[PDB]
Symmetry: C6
Subunit: 274 residues, 6 copies
């Protein structure tokens, strides 16, 4: 059955970004931690955020981390589950579970997997009829934001289109440090220079690189058995066995989407003359 627990992931786990972290805080923590000014001002707290960006960059990581920050249960519904709903009334049960688990951060991973459909409109019906007062917060993830119908992007539903970009160099070394730890590693590992060589490898690609280096370590030690730490040569040579999943054209079209939403923000000099 669905697991409803507080994720152990933390902001330190993912160093991919910092502005998105603060935006998520203001979006989620403030309505629940400080429910004082929202009633004072003409603010109706947003109950929906949609994450978009290249695949395997940490959208699930961001959702889990923000759930951890507020110590609110986290419920994840995978894409295959929505697809079996499509091929296969239980969306109401999912939402009632989330409600009874409040405060909660419901998560819809790759909700665009189906891409007006039975399950999607059922989700819309259940989301619109959800009391915004309750602590339930809904987050969706999709690496193909364009193909999602706009009926989910209307007010009272998922509003904020948050972009999760490819990690930067400092961010990349942060993700590497996060992944390698909890296992033996040489005290003279480059890490930073490891990040610099990484041009456009996503978090998934860095995890794959670390996995391959560990695998080479196991192979070497197992051969020696018939050595207590991951030597430098492992990462030194395994990087030949590394590939960039996301093509530069994909990043450029993601940036085209972002620049569209930015030129939408392009309106300027309005400054209330004094």
């Amino acid at each position: 059955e669905t697991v409803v627990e507080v994720p152990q992931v933390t902001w330190e786990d993912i160093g991919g970004l910092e502005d998105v972290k603060r935006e998520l805080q203001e979006l989620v923590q403030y309505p629940v931690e400080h429910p004082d000014k929202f009633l004072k001002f003409g603010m109706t707290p947003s109950k929906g955020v949609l994450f978009y960006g290249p695949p395997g960059c940490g959208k699930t990581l961001l959702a889990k981390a923000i759930a951890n920050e507020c110590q609110a249960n986290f419920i994840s519904i995978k894409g295959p589950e929505l697809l079996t709903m499509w091929f296969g009334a239980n969306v109401r049960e999912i939402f009632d579970k989330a409600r009874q688990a409040a405060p909660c951060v419901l998560f819809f991973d790759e909700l665009d997997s189906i891409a007006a459909d039975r399950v999607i409109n059922q989700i819309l019906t259940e989301m619109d009829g959800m009391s915004t007062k309750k602590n339930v917060f809904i987050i969706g993830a999709t690496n193909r934001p364009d193909i999602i119908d706009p009926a989910i992007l209307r007010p009272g539903r998922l509003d904020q289109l948050i972009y999760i970009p490819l990690p930067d160099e400092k961010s990349r070394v942060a993700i590497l440090k996060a992944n390698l730890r909890k296992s033996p590693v040489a005290k003279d590992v480059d890490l930073e220079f490891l990040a610099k060589m990484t041009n456009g490898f996503s978090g998934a690609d860095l995890t794959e690189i670390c996995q391959r280096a560990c695998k080479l370590a196991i192979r070497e030690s197992i051969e020696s058995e018939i050595v207590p730490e991951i030597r430098r040569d492992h990462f030194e040579e395994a990087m030949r066995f590394a590939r960039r999943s996301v093509s530069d054209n994909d990043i450029r079209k993601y940036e085209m989407f972002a620049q569209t939403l930015q030129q939408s923000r392009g309106f300027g000099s309005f400054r209330f003359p004094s």
Copy 2:
């Protein structure tokens, strides 16, 4: 279940237009408040109106306000409800509820979401058999009036194709006043200049702008905690993050449709020679 109550919205809440207000009064109030001349003249009161225009302009606001004016119950059926009936005889139950709640203003929000279909034809069957004597009044809203089948525009059904344009400058400041109010705001808010710099922002866009200014106020005050009114700088720095949802081409083709229906009205000099 469906909520059947008199909306608290009022004409003051929306200042987008005035002639539409008057024609809505003549359409709805007159048959119910003054059922004295309709039977005198060869007039069969209209019982259906279809709103069309760019999305997020106040069609729902108009319907709620006109329901409030007559103090008649208001029943809304969202697009997702029709779509789930399409995917999923409940239309009959909806109409019986409306009948038992008479006087009432049944509202079909974005009824073109389905776009000859099963549910739409059931709606037509229930509407044609509805006694015009009863006070029930049916209103439909659609942001894409062209794709709607003509079977709904026939006499005895939704006849009046009303147009809801973008709010004008004075209307825009009226909407800003109607929305911003009920929350702290600086006494020296320009508002009028705020409306003038808004070129083609719809009511939804103005609401988003106000919400963003309020959000910035909350963030600033929360930082100060670790201030009691929405400063001017909030609006000044939030407008740069204001985007016009409806494109100029969309308004141009809406005006093309309106000009088609107007040149249909273009017949002129007939003046009953005397």
Copy 3:
């Protein structure tokens, strides 16, 4: 349920045409009123006629009027009913009702709305197995006569393709008189000059014009209250709000269809040499 009653409409109500009146008389009245020569001659009376023409010209009016002439019940099955049968065995019950109500003029309004289909084939099965002896007479209407499958136009079924053109000028003023009557109207209404200005407005358009004039009268009187006759200015200023529903291209292609059926009739000089 289906209404089985003698329509109160009369030939006086519709002046659109006169030849069709006599042709319908010979089609319907003669087999029932004078069943003396049909068995004498080698003629099997026709039990089906299909009306075609631009929409809103009075096809239903003609059917109701001819039913009134013979004082025979009239059963109407609207397009939404056929289409809900299509989406949703009741055709047999409809025909049994017609039989038990004999003499009757069953009417299939816009039977081409479905456009070989399940309901169409069931209707054909019930019509072929219907005893031509019984007084029941079947009439169909279709604004789109071409898309109708030929399976219904075979002998023993809907055979006579009657055309209902736009009302003539004198016929237009006849329709005006038929409509505005039963309500106050100024003794000095031109009517004839009103019809002359009407270039190609159908009966529905004239009804809309009269309704708009009555609306203006209602509004003016209600304003005056806060006058007992529809003044000339009402029609004078409502005509500018009159639009011709049927485009001249539609009338031209209708006339192309008629000229096709006429050139089929174009065989000439055969004159029985003697």
Copy 4:
């Protein structure tokens, strides 16, 4: 329910052709009337014939007449029945009825109405498993022989593709004599010259002409009432109200099909040198 009776139609009714009469005789009468030589020779009697030709030429007439000649029950299944089978296991019941009614001439009118389908393959299954010994003979009719799948034209099924052409001049006058008879007619009716002026009118068209002339007779007599025989002028003028249903292009493509099946027969000089 299905009617199983010996048709009263006779060869004298239809003078459309003579060779097809003899071919049908040899195909049907011989296997049943004189079942002697078939066993002697290496002949397996054919149990299927498919009629093709322009519509309304007498395929049903031919089937009924041949059934009459052998005094064998005749069962007809209309196209709408097959279509309701398609949209709607009763084919087995139809075939068992035909078997129990043996000798019988089962008739499938416009069996190509559906045009590999459920009902058609069910018919194939029931036909292949039908004992050729039994007197049952199956005849199919289709005015669109090309669109019929070839699975029905294999040996052991409908073999003989019999063409039913447009009636000749003498045949046309024979058809007229068959039609106008049994009702009053002037002793000085052309008939022969009536046929000559008829260029390409099918049997259905000639029946329509006779029906229209009778209709004019009824109209004239009933007008005189407010004359005991169909005068010459009725046919003289009603022929202006006559049309040729089948276009010359349709006849030419039917003849293209026939000439294909004839050049298939084009093999010549083989004469067994002696």
Copy 5:
């Protein structure tokens, strides 16, 4: 129900070919009559063969004859049965019947009539799980071998793609002798010259010719009654009504397929140098 009996057809009935006969013996007889060497060698007997070639050439005749040679039951499943299973778990019952009837030669006539499908996949599932030890032998026939999914041509399924060409002149006279016999025929029938003048007539066409000659004999004798052997003039005057069903282009593309499978076999000079 399915008939399971040893066919009475024999190799003498069909003289279309001889090498195919021998290879069929080696395929079927050897595993069952002489199960002595297969286990000695690394030979897993084939349990599937697919016949392909122009229609009406004797594929069913070949299957029946080979079943007769081994005196093993023969089960035939016609194409309509597969199609009705497709439209309509009976494949399992068919295979259980074949198993209980072992030794048997299951035959799937025109199994490509459906042309990955439900029934064909069920057939594959039942065939793969069939113990090759058992005497059951599966043969499929299809005159359109290209459109058949390759899933059936894998090892452990129908392997051998056997080709059945048009009968040769000597083969044609053999077929004529096999068919004409058992009925009176003149002692001076050339037969051989009849075969020579037959250019590309298939077995079905030769059977049609014989049937037509017999029919003419019946007609002549039946006329003479109102003679005891089939005269030469019957064949002479019936040959002119003989048509070659299979076009030259069809045989050419069949030979294209055969030449493809032969050039695949075209690998040559490999000869084990010694």
Copy 6:
């Protein structure tokens, strides 16, 4: 029912390759045989590999052999089983059987046969919810790797895309030795030169060649009866009866895919400067 047993195939059987042998060893044996370093290092063992390559190269052979090496049960689900799942909840039963049989090597043969579908999504759901701790290891096979949806290639699922190329010349003679063995063969058989002539024959093609040689031996011995060793002439001549199943274009595009995955691996000089 599904068979759960340790395959008797061994690495000595298929000599098609050597590198994939060690790769599969490190993938499967190490996590179960020596589960000492996996928890020490930060590596989560992979629980899924997907085989791709030209058909009939031994993918099933590799899976069975690797299952044999660890002495773990082996469950195979064929393509027709998945397709009857698609046309026909039992995937869960399959996985429960695999779990209860742990350690096991579940095999999905030609899982791309279906080519987001119901069965594929159910398989993904069952695979994601499968505890990686358990010894169960999942292997998939597809000779059309491109058409497979990427939903199965994400981390935590079938991850390692292993390529099974055409056997090398030494490998080809190894396969010949593995196949021909267990049956009589001459002591003076080329084998090596036999392999050299084999340019691009896959394992299935070599099996076909051996089967044809055994067939010829069977035929010659059976003729001689009416010799106890497979003579050289059998292979000498049967090679003229052999064909290469895989076209050089297919291998070229397979190598195009391989070179794509290699250029993805093309990142080079990263060598940890020191």
